[PDB]
Ligand SMILES: C[NH+](C)c1cc(NC(=O)CNC(C)(C)C)c(O)c2c1C[C@H]1C[C@H]3[C@H]([NH+](C)C)C(O)=C(C(N)=O)C(=O)[C@@]3(O)C(O)=C1C2=O
Ligand SMILES: [Cl-]
Ligand SMILES: [Cl-]
Ligand SMILES: [Cl-]
Ligand SMILES: [Cl-]
């Protein structure tokens with residue numbers, strides 16, 4: 218089949234949904250594209266290069282709330298940015314593990330620069346704007362990684378000692394399972410953003 | 425060598441520091457222990473069983489602030505608990521990737537039950553206590569993974585605000601700042617009760 222950049226990525230994302238990150242191999246990708254491995258090699262050197270391209274392409278295609286809307290509050294921006302980030306990472310199997318394995322490229326540095334300019338124009342110190350951006354990223358990535366690695370584990374581990382659970386824990390585990398963690402995520406997000414606001418709002422006052 | 429639980433985990437943690445999570449295999453573990461693969465299999469069925477056990481044992485050995493002190497505020501407990509969790513995850517190479525996706529083990533049940541009892545005895549609903557505990561976990565995991573990996577915000581080419589931000593600064597600062605933000609947000613939510621907030 219065609220081996221333009223776009224088609225190679227389309228097949229690689231299809232393979233990633235089939236195999237997950239550990240099972241994705243250039244051999245399987247060649248077979249899916251109907252080509253020999255040395256043909257694929259001309260197009261993409263190794264699994265590392267493929268995963269780096271997939272991470273960038275997952276965000277470029279599906280993380281579309283990178284930049285604040287005209288006159289958007291910093292609160293609303295961080296919220297929409299986090300939801301778009303989570304949604305992009307959840308779109309492919311082990312998508313967060315794909316994102317984790319890559320260094321930010323020139324385009325990701327430009328995006329953080331725009332975000333940091335925005336935060337500082339909204340009254341954040343440089344340090345505090347970057348800590349807010351990093352905290353939202355760390356929280357969102359951890360939430361998604363815990364959700365996808367729980368699903369990956371479900372292959373080799375059944376569910377564990379039911380009979381044994383103490384009662385708050387048992388009820389808690391039932392609540393988190395009702396919705397695969399969207400509620401936990403959205404609640405935690407509001408907490409994080411409000412915390413940033415209380416800190417910013419103090420200015421130089423002890424808080 | 426000895427193949428009790430403790431010695432298999434010691435060897436596996438030594439291997440993990442050598443190879444990282446992707447490179448840790450039952451075959452390389454058998455080699456490290458000086459045994460044949462079918463000998464190891466009797467003790468350890470597969471990599472998932474090994475990783476699950478390492479997640480538990482890393483906290484048992486290195487997570488020292490599982491429980492609130494007598495009379496400690498919930499804020500202080502979440503802060504001390506998160507620092508201790510971060511410290512345990514950083515103790516071994518790819519420690520946060522070893523933790524990812526695990527669930528509380530039966531040997532952690534009493535500990536996690538005490539955490540939830542404590543939050544609810546401090547005024548959190550079960551849901552709100554649980555979301556605080558989950559958000560602290562997920563944030564700490566994110567922060568450590570981005571530190572063990574190198575995943576977030578060439579020197580000539582950095583854009584200028586980012587470059588100045590990096591110049592006026594190993595993850596701990598951003599982590600501790602984010603932790604205080606999360607704790608304050610929990611407190612605003614708890615204090616609001618039924619008020620529009
Ligand atoms: C909130 N409780 C009910 C809970 C639930 C899950 N897992 C899930 O909800 C699984 N959710 C799916 C199945 C993806 C829908 C959880 O996965 C967890 C926890 C508890 C935490 C407690 C963490 C705690 N610290 C960091 C806040 C802690 O100190 C310990 C400890 N001393 O052993 C933990 O075990 C903890 O770090 C931890 O790992 C938890 C969970 O994994
Ligand atoms: Cl072609
Ligand atoms: Cl193309
Ligand atoms: Cl390869
Ligand atoms: Cl972003």
Ligand SMILES: [Cl-]
Pocket residue numbers: 425426427428
């Ligand atoms: Cl033995």
Ligand SMILES: [Cl-]
Pocket residue numbers: 428429430431
């Ligand atoms: Cl033992």
Ligand SMILES: [Cl-]
Pocket residue numbers: 450469470471472
């Ligand atoms: Cl295995």
Ligand SMILES: [Cl-]
Pocket residue numbers: 591
């Ligand atoms: Cl300079």
Ligand SMILES: [Mg+2]
Pocket residue numbers: 523526527528561
């Ligand atoms: Mg856990």
